[PDB]
């Protein structure tokens, strides 16, 4: 803290002496990338004293070869430029040379004015006549993220990570590029991007515990959305035909290294599509995105970090399909009992979970037990992108009954390395069944399933106005970034992730 | 209503009789717009019996001239097509003609197969051979939104508005087009789009009361954001140079025709800009968007609805500037007392609010009093887009002190027709002052100012790492759409606005 208090003392001295104190505006002549572009191929030793330029960035290096010569590195917009400050060139009307430069520290934001060219040793340089302190750094910075107190500083103080660590800047640029690619894919198909409410008197459309809030003037409990699905289907009733939404969902659950209370999701709804159409689209969209980002469909992934084992993920299309129940039964060496939601089958699934050392869910609903079995026996087969298809109705209250398989729905999930990326189905559009599945959901919630949702009467009424046959789909954008950028925890792909206090 | 009950009984009859019941997949040959493009110019009476096509849409009309000849209109993706169903073309493998058509009602989503062409009277038609009920409508629909019970039905059941009313569909395509324009403008300048948290252990960056929630596992209270500003500025400390975010902010306040609990806002931050640069950018961005949508810079506005008076809004640049204090003082006929936040000026502004019958704020802070006076004397002058500039520091805790004007800041608001559209300033980047102004905001909060924010220690520490000279800017997208679309309430430009009950 001595360095910080000393810096406040310096700045007070600068202000009281009438020297530059946080200048409002510094007019650069060009960006540092442009400067490297215009001068990065001059002859060694070239200097143009007929051109005075102004540059600015953050100081990353200060070296004094002598009391008369000082070398700076400044960094801005991914470009480093060296500043050579020779006392012979200094503008005395800005102060004596030693005074001007004694106010500068590594980490400061500074401006320089001078002549362009390259040093005799060949370094792109500005031969400076002056230096302005634009915004001082009051703390001693490390030279790299290795010198941070610990690597959680990167998440709690993300500006330090971005300032010092090119890899972190790269991730969030890639994140923006990937989302651009996705919007363009759907815009070219004639989709309409929409926004639906994040605050509602009800929640639904996913299996998640919601955040609860309160509107004081309405005196009403509200929920933050867990998914936009039910609103988006109303827009298809309304005739908009192809809609998508990219935004935050909120889940009130565990904050570990791979779960964040808010996450970025996309959904789209396409009238007259079924889940087979959506499989084809998923493959085209995601393989095209991987090809765009990586230049091939085979990309590395390091589950235990960059010095650990590497798995090469192959996105070559088409992808493997695993049928939900059949693959469980192949793993068990026994068939599930029918109906899948009978007490007989619930008891059987409990027994199978205990036999295979699968953690039991609470409460022990057929749907939650089926999910545990799928997690053990099927998700574990999904190394390369793989579709798990035809989920039981009992775990898929909004998915339409399978046109051929009793008790199943026209649903798929996309898994990569055993992690869920997409969830999609032929949409249930028959209001009697929809109401019945909502009632079974509400019973699960009353029995202690914090992930079951209440009945939504406004959605049932919308279905009574005629939802066309429709296919809908969701994508977890954060998990997708994790694979594309090869990061093994979600805190790497979210600028300001939640952290335990 | 007997209609809904009867329709449910019809569908149960259909299901039990093995007749088509919510088909999973209907494969259209082409969209109705594509159909009109291909066949819209054939001769009257043309029919191509060598081509069989499948079309689908929602039934908007059923008419007939005998038991043998039925006429439908179907509507889909903004295009109407007439279907001519002659018993002599009926495919009996789908049932008897009279039975197949007895199942169809106005409002149903239906499919047809048949031959393309035009009736002798010149109507684009499909000469059908079959009809499929895809998703029935269980309610009797009006033919236009005028037949709705009330016009709050348009907002509470938006699918009915979208289904019946072309003007509502136009609004939301316009909204998408405008947001697309804004992204492209900033993408071309090299900006990076980012996402920052909507859930925080603190709130800040705007004047608004927040929604409060709770994270159960972390056992900690959270706030929904009122603005992303404090996170976005950390990204500039981090070196990202040019960032923007387009997302929801949340305000826990009154719900009415112009106030929604959530609204769509944009912010951007640009290193090395000042508020003068931001005024020029606002003019360029907004006038170019107006030009893109309207074809000129002079656009109509109907503050009392479409048959009422029409105002012309003139976006020709440069726009009028009003200086905050000077214009208040011109309206008063006398000067405010200095310092503006002295008890003397607080007493004086209370007296002025009383004399001019201005509703007093609570509490009676200098900032809220200054805001009441500016709303009365200055915002009312802002018909055409106009900048109110140089706000007092006492109401601008995050804006940098004005380089020429004591007590003022380098801030502007953009007003159109007396309503705020933008808020922007040269960013305060001096940490001592920033802490002082945060404490002042905390004191307002403790005195009952539900719109003042608590001190953010994480942000103060971020400024201690050096925020470059920076300009930041926010835009209320909903208000913008209201003007661009000539709508006089916010419920018209939000798909699912919050409503009473
Ligand atoms: N709402 C789903 C995504 C879309 C499912 C198909 N309608 C989810 O959160 O997983
Ligand atoms: N946070 C401001 C917009 C940005 C102002 C300039 N930093 C608002 O909500 O009005």
User: What single string gives the DSSP state of each residue in B205-237?
Assistant: SSS-PPPEEEETTTTEEEEE-S-SHHHHHHHHH
> What stretches of A317-400 adopt beta strand conformation (E)?
320-323, 386-389
The closest CB to that of B194, out of A172, A467, A469, belongs to A172
Q: Give the DSSP H or E segment for B31.
A: none
Task: Search chain B and give the residue with CA nearest A209.
Answer: B216
- The rounded distance, in Å, linking the Cα atoms of B21 and B129 is 19
Structure tokens, A435: 């109401």
Q: For ligand 1, say whether the CB of A397 is within 6 Å of any of its atoms.
A: no
The answer to whether A340 touches A407, Cβ cutoff 8 Å, is yes
Q: What 3-state DSSP class applies to A384?
A: coil
Residue A268 DSSP class? E
Q: For ligand 2, say whether the CB of B228 is within 6 Å of any of its atoms.
A: no
> What stretches of B18-163 adopt beta strand conformation (E)?
53-66, 69-76, 79-86, 109-118, 124-135
Q: What 3-state DSSP class applies to A221?
A: strand
Q: With 0-12 CB in 10 A as exposed, 13-18 as middle and 19+ as buried, what is B463?
A: buried
Per-domain residue ranges for chain A?
1-144, 145-499
Contact at CB, A234 and B136, closer than 8 angstroms: no
- Which of A245, A241, A121, A266 lies closest to A189 in space, CA to CA? A241
| CA contacts within 13 A on the Cβ side of B297 | 14
Chain breaks in chain B (C to N over 2.5 A) after: none
- The rounded distance, in Å, linking the Cα atoms of A474 and A267 is 4
Q: Classify strands A53-66 and A109-118 as parallel, antiparallel or unpaired.
A: antiparallel
Contact at CB, A495 and B231, closer than 8 angstroms: yes
Torsion angle, CA of B423/B425/B430/B432, rounded to 10 degrees?
-40
| CA contacts within 13 A on the Cβ side of B182 | 24
Which fold, B145-499? Answer: BirA Bifunctional Protein; domain 2 (3.30.930)
Sign of CA dihedral B369, B371, B376, B378: positive
- Burial code (b: 16+ CB inside 10 Å, e: under 16) for B170-192 equals ebbebbbebbeebbebbeeeebb
Q: Classify strands B124-135 and B79-86 as parallel, antiparallel or unpaired.
A: parallel
Sign of CA dihedral A392, A397, A399, A403: positive
Q: For ligand 1, say whether the CB of A205 is within 6 Å of any of its atoms.
A: yes
| B211 is known to lie in a ligand binding site | no
Q: For ligand 2, say whether the CB of B472 is within 6 Å of any of its atoms.
A: yes
The closest CB to that of A195, out of B173, B217, B264, belongs to B264
The answer to whether A374 touches A423, Cβ cutoff 8 Å, is no
- Which of B251, B264, B255, B263 lies closest to B498 in space, CA to CA? B255
Mutation pick from A28, A226, A239 vs chain B, by most beta carbons of B within 10 Å, is A239
> Which of A227, A231, A249 for mutating ligand 1's site (highest number of atoms within 8 Å of CB)?
A227
* Residues whose CB falls within 8 Å of the CB of residue A393, separated by 6 or more in sequence, listed in order: A340, A399, A401, A407, A408, A409, A437
Q: Show residues of chain A in contact with B109, CB under 8 Å.
A: 466-469
Structure tokens, A273: 């599509």
Sign of CA dihedral A172, A178, A181, A186: negative
User: Phi then psi for B379, rounded to 5 degrees?
Assistant: -55, -35
Residue B434 DSSP class? H
- The rounded distance, in Å, linking the Cα atoms of A229 and A232 is 5
User: Phi then psi for B35, rounded to 5 degrees?
Assistant: -60, -45
Q: Which residues are B348's β-sheet partners?
A: none
The answer to whether A119 touches A84, Cβ cutoff 8 Å, is yes
Contact at CB, A162 and B238, closer than 8 angstroms: yes
Centre of ligand 1 to C-alpha B156, Å, is 23
Q: Show residues of chain B in contact with A218, CB under 8 Å.
A: 255, 500
> What stretches of A156-231 adopt beta strand conformation (E)?
192-193, 199-200, 212-215, 220-224
Q: What 3-state DSSP class applies to A270?
A: strand
> What stretches of B402-443 adopt beta strand conformation (E)?
411-416, 419-426
User: Phi then psi for B93, rounded to 5 degrees?
Assistant: -60, -10
* Residues whose CB falls within 8 Å of the CB of residue A284, separated by 6 or more in sequence, listed in order: A317
Nearest Cα residue to atom 9 of ligand 2: B206
* Residues whose CB falls within 8 Å of the CB of residue B355, separated by 6 or more in sequence, listed in order: none
Give A14-22 contacts, CB < 8 A, sequence gap 24+.
A14/A103, A14/A133, A19/A95, A19/A103, A20/A132, A20/A133, A22/A134, A22/A135, A22/B400, A22/B429, A22/B430, A22/B469
Q: Classify strands B242-250 and A109-118 as parallel, antiparallel or unpaired.
A: unpaired
Torsion angle, CA of A102/A106/A109/A113, rounded to 10 degrees?
60
**CATH class of the domain comprising A1-144:** mainly beta
Residues comprising chain A, all counted: 501
For chains A and B, count residue pairs whose Cβ atoms are closer than 8 Å. 279
| CA contacts within 13 A on the Cβ side of A100 | 24
Q: With 0-12 CB in 10 A as exposed, 13-18 as middle and 19+ as buried, what is A207?
A: buried
Q: Which numbered atom of ligand 1 lies nearest the CA of A233?
A: 7
Q: For ligand 2, say whether the CB of B423 is within 6 Å of any of its atoms.
A: yes
| B421 is known to lie in a ligand binding site | yes
Q: Which residues are B413's β-sheet partners?
A: B388, B423
- Which of B119, B123, B36 lies closest to B77 in space, CA to CA? B36
Q: What 3-state DSSP class applies to A452?
A: coil
- The rounded distance, in Å, linking the Cα atoms of A460 and A462 is 5
* Residues whose CB falls within 8 Å of the CB of residue A24, separated by 6 or more in sequence, listed in order: B274, B400, B403, B410, B426, B469
Vertex B247, ends B242 and B248: CA angle to 5°? 145
How far is residue B301 from each of residues B292, B293, B383, B478, measured CA to CA in Å? 17, 14, 11, 16
- Which of A251, A158, A477 lies closest to B196 in space, CA to CA? A158
Contact at CB, B138 and A464, closer than 8 angstroms: yes
Q: For ligand 1, say whether the CB of A206 is within 6 Å of any of its atoms.
A: yes
Phi-psi region of A18 (alpha: psi -120 to 50; beta: other; left: phi over 0): left
Q: Show residues of chain B in contact with A275, CB under 8 Å.
A: none
The closest CB to that of B261, out of A215, A432, A458, belongs to A215
Contact at CB, B24 and A469, closer than 8 angstroms: yes
Q: Classify strands B212-215 and B199-200 as parallel, antiparallel or unpaired.
A: unpaired
Q: Classify strands A411-416 and A220-224 as parallel, antiparallel or unpaired.
A: unpaired
Gyration radius from chain B CA atoms: 30
Q: For ligand 2, say whether the CB of B497 is within 6 Å of any of its atoms.
A: no
- Which of A424, A431, A427 lies closest to A398 in space, CA to CA? A427
Contact at CB, B495 and A261, closer than 8 angstroms: no
Residue A55 DSSP class? E
Contact at CB, B76 and A239, closer than 8 angstroms: yes
User: Phi then psi for A85, rounded to 5 degrees?
Assistant: -105, 105
Nearest Cα residue to atom 7 of ligand 1: A472
3-state secondary structure B463-501: HCCCCCCEEEEEEEHHHHHHHHCCCCCHHHHCCCCCCCC
Q: Which residues are B399's β-sheet partners?
A: B427
- Which of A377, A373, A376 lies closest to A392 in space, CA to CA? A373
Torsion angle, CA of B339/B344/B346/B347, rounded to 10 degrees?
-160
> Which of A229, A234, A277 for mutating ligand 1's site (highest number of atoms within 8 Å of CB)?
A229
- The rounded distance, in Å, linking the Cα atoms of A225 and A235 is 17
Q: For ligand 1, say whether the CB of A424 is within 6 Å of any of its atoms.
A: yes
Instruction: Tell me the resolution in Å.
Output: 1.9
How many other β-carbons are positioned within 10 Å of the β-carbon of residue A181? 14
How many other β-carbons are positioned within 10 Å of the β-carbon of residue A153? 15
Largest CA distance in chain A: 92
- The rounded distance, in Å, linking the Cα atoms of A26 and A267 is 44
Centre of ligand 2 to C-alpha B455, Å, is 17
The answer to whether B427 touches B462, Cβ cutoff 8 Å, is no
Q: Show residues of chain A in contact with B262, CB under 8 Å.
A: 197-199
Q: What 3-state DSSP class applies to B141?
A: coil
């Amino acid at each position: 803290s001595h360095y910080t208090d000393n810096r406040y003392k310096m700045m007070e001295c600068i202000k009281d002496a009438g020297r530059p104190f946080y200048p409002h505006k510094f007019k650069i002549s060009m960006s540092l990338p442009a400067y490297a572009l215009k001068y990065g191929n001059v002859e060694n030793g070239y200097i143009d004293k007929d051109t005075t330029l102004s540059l600015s960035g953050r100081v990353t290096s200060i070296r004094s070869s002598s009391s008369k010569l000082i070398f700076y590195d400044i960094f801005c917009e991914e470009q480093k430029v060296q500043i050579i400050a020779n006392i012979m060139e200094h503008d005395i009307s800005t102060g004596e040379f030693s005074v001007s430069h004694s106010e500068i520290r590594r980490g400061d934001v500074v401006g320089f004015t001078g002549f362009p060219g390259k040093s005799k040793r060949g370094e792109l340089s500005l031969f400076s006549k002056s230096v302005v302190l634009l915004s001082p750094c009051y703390h001693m910075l490390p030279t790299a993220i290795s010198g941070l107190k610990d690597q959680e500083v990167r998440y709690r103080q993300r500006y330090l990570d971005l300032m010092l660590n090119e890899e972190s800047r790269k991730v969030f640029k890639l994140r923006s590029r990937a989302i651009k690619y996705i919007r363009n894919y759907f815009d070219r198909l004639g989709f309409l991007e929409v926004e639906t409410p994040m605050l509602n008197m009800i929640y639904g459309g996913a299996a998640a515990r919601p955040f609860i809030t309160y509107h004081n003037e309405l005196e009403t409990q509200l929920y933050m959305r867990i998914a936009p699905e039910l609103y988006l289907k109303q827009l298809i009733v309304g005739g908009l035909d192809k809609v998508y939404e990219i935004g935050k969902n909120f889940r009130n659950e565990g904050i570990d290294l791979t779960h964040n209370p808010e996450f970025t999701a996309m959904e789209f709804y396409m009238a007259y599509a079924d889940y087979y159409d959506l499989m084809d689209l998923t493959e085209e969209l995601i393989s095209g995105l991987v090809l765009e980002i990586h230049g091939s469909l085979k990309i590395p992934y390091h589950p235990d970090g960059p010095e650990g084992k590497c798995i090469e993920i192959d996105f070559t299309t088409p992808w493997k399909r695993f049928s939900f129940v059949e693959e469980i039964e192949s793993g068990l060496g026994e068939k599930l009992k029918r109906p899948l939601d009978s007490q007989e089958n619930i008891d059987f699934m409990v027994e199978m979970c205990e036999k295979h050392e699968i953690e039991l869910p609470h409460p022990r609903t057929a749907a939650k037990l089926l999910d545990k079995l799928a997690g053990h026996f099927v998700e574990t087969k999904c190394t390369n992108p793989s579709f798990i298809i035809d989920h039981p109705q009992t775990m898929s209250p909004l998915a339409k009954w399978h046109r051929e398989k009793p008790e199943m729905t026209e649903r798929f999930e996309l898994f990569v390395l055993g992690k869920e990326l997409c969830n999609a189905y032929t949409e249930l559009n028959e209001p009697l069944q929809q109401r019945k599945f909502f009632e079974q959901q509400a019973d699960a919630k009353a029995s202690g399933d914090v992930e079951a949702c209440p009945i939504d009467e406004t959605f049932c009424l919308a279905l009574e106005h005629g939802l066309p046959p429709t296919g809908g789909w969701g994508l977890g954008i954060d998990r997708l970034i994790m694979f594309l950028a090869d990061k093994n925890n979600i805190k790497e792909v979210i600028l300001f992730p939640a952290m335990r206090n």
